[PDB]
Ligand binder design. Structure first.
Ligand SMILES: CNc1ncnc2c1ncn2[C@@H]1O[C@H](CO)[C@@H](O)[C@H]1O
Length: 371
């Protein structure tokens, strides 16, 4: 058994799918760990750090993919990587197959076995590998929203927390899930007057207790959302629905009635976004205009703080990585139903019903390959 970790190849993808701690634990259990030279540098992990932990440093991506029985990544394989996919390999990474027929087809045709980080799901319904990325994105949303509120960024020119005697930014967070909770928490810590909207009153009750009412909570009726958004300096869209696409909760018509220079940060942009006018941008020109407002729609936000997010992710993936390495995909999935819910492809079979219907291709019951 060799576990291989290649360098991430997507635009501004600085994260890596393992850290020296994880390398140490794998090598201690008798597994070889092959890591592409430079793979951790985006995350401030040097080749020397990885080697001291037991990793075999490999000069090329091609050798990692060729030699590895278990291949750990952060993002989905891109076109340039399709020719590296292999029948006898297990790939464990964020896949988002519903968003790519091409990626889905590449995995099936290769016959490879793949497990998606984002559909690994515990009995209580939680998504333990997606969770830390939602936490990072939410906290990032507050700090990037604060920055783009500066007049020198085209924003309204409002300081998050005000100063004594002067109004703070009015911040509206749409969605009180993991991402939204974390956005409201940081925005609140910066001094902003934060209102969180959700249709799940239990989540609002949780926010109300945690901050003793300092974070305002409003039931998200259409009337309430319009009114709050109209008054906001900063709107953070954090309604991320697990699976298919995000609802368009904020219309361009509504945007036209917003304060000039208001900033809208969509952290559901990887699901088409929850604003109507949202188009996925990137760090080069992260913002565009919509009716005198500024939209921030950068996809893959956690990639911008890789030192943090590499650890957040791999801390969460570690026990699954160890199970897969120790026991192989089938035994691991048989023993751990949370991991089985991530099973995506195997030997040309597509194993996600939700992915299959969204693409309109056949689905093979996961039970048929596990039992
Ligand atoms: C108005 N429409 C809406 N407004 C506010 N939150 C919503 C919403 N639709 C879904 N959500 C919430 O989004 C959160 C995270 O996806 C969940 O807590 C949902 O309850």
């Amino acid at each position: 058994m060799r576990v291989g970790i290649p360098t991430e190849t997507k635009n501004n993808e600085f994260r890596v799918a393992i850290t020296p701690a994880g390398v140490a634990e794998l090598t201690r259990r008798g597994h070889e760990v092959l890591i592409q030279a430079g793979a951790g540098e985006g995350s401030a992990i040097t080749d020397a750090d990885f080697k001291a932990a037991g990793a075999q440093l490999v000069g090329t991506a091609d050798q990692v993919w060729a030699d590895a029985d278990l291949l750990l990544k952060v993002k989905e394989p891109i076109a340039a990587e399709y020719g590296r996919l292999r029948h006898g390999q297990i790939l464990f990474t964020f896949l988002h197959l519903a968003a790519s027929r091409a990626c889905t087809d590449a995995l099936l045709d290769s016959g490879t076995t793949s497990i998606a980080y984002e559909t690994v799901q515990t009995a209580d319904g939680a998504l333990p590998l997606l969770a830390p990325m939602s936490e990072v994105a939410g906290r990032l949303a507050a700090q990037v929203g604060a920055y783009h509120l500066m007049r020198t960024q085209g924003g309204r020119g409002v300081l998050m927390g005000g100063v004594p005697g002067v109004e703070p930014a009015d911040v509206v967070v749409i969605g009180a899930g993991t991402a939204g909770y974390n956005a409201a928490r940081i925005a609140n810590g910066m001094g902003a007057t934060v209102t969180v909207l959700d249709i799940n009153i239990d989540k609002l009750r949780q926010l109300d207790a945690e901050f003793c009412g300092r974070i305002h909570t409003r039931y998200s009726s259409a009337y309430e959302l319009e009114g709050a958004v109209k008054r906001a300096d900063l709107v953070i869209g954090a309604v991320l629905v697990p699976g298919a696409k995000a609802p368009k909760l904020v219309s361009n018509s509504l945007v036209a009635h917003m304060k000039p220079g208001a900033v809208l940060v969509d952290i559901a942009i990887d699901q088409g976004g929850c604003f109507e006018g949202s188009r996925p941008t990137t760090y080069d020109h992260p913002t565009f205009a919509v009716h005198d407002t500024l939209f921030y729609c950068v996809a893959n936000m956690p990639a911008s703080v890789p030192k943090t997010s590499t650890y957040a992710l791999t801390n969460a993936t570690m026990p699954y990585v160890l199970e897969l390495a120790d026991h192989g995909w089938r035994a691991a999935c048989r023993s751990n139903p949370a991991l089985a819910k991530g099973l995506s492809t195997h030997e040309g079979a597509l194993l996600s019903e939700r992915v299959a219907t969204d693409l309109g291709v056949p689905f093979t019951e996961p039970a048929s390959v596990l039992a």
